[model samples]
Target: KVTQERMEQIYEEVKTPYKYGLAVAPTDNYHKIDCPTVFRQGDKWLMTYVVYNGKTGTDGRGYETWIAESDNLLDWRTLGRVLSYRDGKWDCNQRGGFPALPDMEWGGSYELQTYKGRHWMTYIGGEGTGYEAVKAPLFVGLASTKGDISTAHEWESLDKPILSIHDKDAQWWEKLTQYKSTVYWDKDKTLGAPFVMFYNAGGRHPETDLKGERVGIALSKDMKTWKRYPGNPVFAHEADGTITGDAHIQKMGDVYVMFYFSAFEPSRKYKAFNTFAASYDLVNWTDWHGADLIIPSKNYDELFAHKSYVIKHDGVVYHFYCAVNNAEQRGIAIATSKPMGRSAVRFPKPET
Candidate 1:
């Protein structure tokens, strides 16, 4: 009984309300910020975000993943640098895109999730001069901290990348590169994987008809090792649009909901990036809202808002997303919804 009309009604009940003025901007030298991932650890809300000076050629200016601590989601105690690139290493020179930071990063930005009683994070690193100057394959790297997230030294990091473009076996859709992934425990065993990773990747050649970015899936039993689903690039544009990545997936009721960025039709940028999809099984997705501005950018977010993460805490749903100020400066913002529950969404088995 899930008609388009019913889905629309349900969305209104559960969707978070965004207000540009209420957004929390960084209070430091971070000129532009994006690819934010937020999670609750202990009694504090922790955010792992990409912080960078504007994309201008500078001798010392660079981007990297930083950690911030907050009692309330609004106020933050930020540490300028939480992760960095290795000295003279191959994957040191990071580059463009928010998911890939596609514009900047030394080592790269990352996400934090708990597994095996440890705080695990995955970030990007690559071998390149810069996006505008040069290009290279971006690699996804992993790290783990026992308990304390603030102590950078106490964490153990992997010397190699867990996922990358180097997967020679990757299909034409994901042959270009792979980075900017979101992972969560699949407690339902629905996708036949303990951990599900939704990442940004696509073909390097424009001829492949797989231009721009596409979202793919990989499964991990032990957070360190990953196996791409045989059917890679599970999510993509059916028609003209390209650039679909920076995925955030959450399970509500009977379906898995995914909110991602898109450039509508035939464009590969964030200018028109705002879209969402749904799936009963994680492998097959249907655009629940076709190019509808799920969380329309307003005022401060006039440029665009992409790569958002949502978490339900204490019956209230909070959405954390990176907002751009006129396409130049970017910061993070939070949108909240009234207490949302499984009952809020009522969709039947999608027609095959």
Candidate 2:
């Protein structure tokens, strides 16, 4: 029921300043890192992140999921790799699709949430299983762990997938591939429902030659079977092959905030892909972070920053993102809110 006029006004009122904190350099065998998922366990902050060695897997170029811990949201200690490529599996090869990897070329996009008594993680299985392999669509599968997530060998991936494009069968706007998702519940449904999932969808735009992206919504009563919102794509923008994907959303009061990365746009000078938007309902969204570029390309994060996770602890808000350098390097970086104000601000660390 929202019109174009209302959407514009809502975007204007949302304000946040993403002050760059520090870029987390890679350690051990993990040379590149991104896709940081952080949460509090007790007194420590636990983070599950994606990492890579530049060359691994059957494709020789892929990434894996890893774990770490932090005390003050600054210094982080690496635990170890949690999820990786398995040989003889569908995700390992380059030509055909497996139950997992789209090709050895893909990795990362890991999200964690608590369900029932166990902690569950849903990761992108870029390739399909069985005969569907290369010809089929991309999907997301589930993994679970009962005890401390830091304990290695305790995590288990389910043999089956929990969400997929097959659920829609190339219907409506989501014809490309379905993956890169985040979920929450709604009571007002908007404020509280059973399960609300926000996922990525991309395909070739009919008007343009370049492929573009769209964000879609899904609802589930039992977290088992999900139904797509009739208004599937909640947000979309047109320009060449560029668009927004890999989003994370959260509700602060009655406003819904969305954080996502922009696709590589050639004409755009400020390629600060990390962007923001706001909405009262998931469907009607307004772009808030327009070309502001939270993290710039001149410093530690010279390449680009994308796929962020935000958490408000105590009174401070910590924004975590994957920071890349040029074409070959990647790691994690963070920015913070000033405890009370919404503007994002930053400060340098003291030289040791």
Candidate 3:
């Protein structure tokens, strides 16, 4: 178990004093960019993030996964789209992806692990047209790329989804729709599975019918086939309309730290923010009640700051998250353990 004292120590180790500004932002064509997953390739770093065009009746492209490269963890340049919007596919509209199987050891090599000679990513997909449209239900889809990951090429996705709300085994906590998912390569079979996936979804309380987002577990011996854990929703908030989602896991010594985002709870001060949970085993998690890992304080992120992907490199801890201002413009921002100063990158004002 991770004691309170240890949690404090972990907070101290990961807290960032300075907020580094936008690392990746939307251009005129794209309306939003979010969900950053950072990993190292040789001496350089790469990030897999998603871009949204406009809501329905405008651009209406929905979410598509894109890749960006950075020499340092601060400055970034988008390469190209790795997962594009398919026209007639089941995942035609939404395709937001998070890279899978990164070396999770805290302060260790932040490189992605390959299985069957291909790199993998788990993403949320749907056929709905608008911003997470209510008409179509989202499901979990898998994509894989062979050879060099730094190159921005289209990743091959399976024809069908791996996890869906319509499935016979779907639990009450994930009966609505599935969202972001991150797969961990459990080489030791800690949960008696070689591959473990942590994903968040929308569902209602069985008895109360209060709706919310919650995180659950899915196990797989191979990267393709998955099975939901019997005891699911490993992490959730009791609040009626709260969200406990977007899990990013890192292993530190004997404990596993899960960095995730929460929002829309009537109790919390911020509308949206980043927090963490710890666990000795992969099944049970202990939520951190301390200060948020990332919150909205700057003009760039005054409205909401949520969705987390944290990494430690060269003695500096980088916490990357989605930053949204009151204008509803979204971008990727970073906060560092050290004082790295501010970034000059700014989003262009919307044309009225």
Q: Please give the RMSD to the true structure for each candidate, in Å.
A: 9.7, 8.0, 1.5
What is the per-residue lDDT of model 1 for residues 11-127, given as tens digits with 9 covering 90 to 100? 654467644232345444335566766655457776677655544344323446666677755565675455664556545555222221110111112234456777666666666
If both were scored by lDDT, which would come out higher, candidate 1 or candidate 2? 1
Candidate 2 lDDT, 262-300, residue by residue in tens: 756564565646767767767887775334435555355
TM-score of every candidate relative to the true structure: 0.78, 0.75, 0.97
Give RMSD (Å) of candidate 3 vs. truth: 1.5
lDDT of 3 by residue, 155-252 (tens): 98988999999999999998889988999999889888999999999999888888999999999998888899998888998787899999999999
- Cα-lDDT of candidate 3: 0.88
The candidate that achieves the highest lDDT relative to the unseen native structure: 3
Rank candidates by lDDT, best first: 3, 1, 2
Candidate 2 local distance difference test against the native:
0.57
Give each model's whole-structure lDDT: 0.59, 0.57, 0.88
TM-score of 1: 0.78
Candidate 3 or 1, higher lDDT:
3
State the TM-score for model 2: 0.75
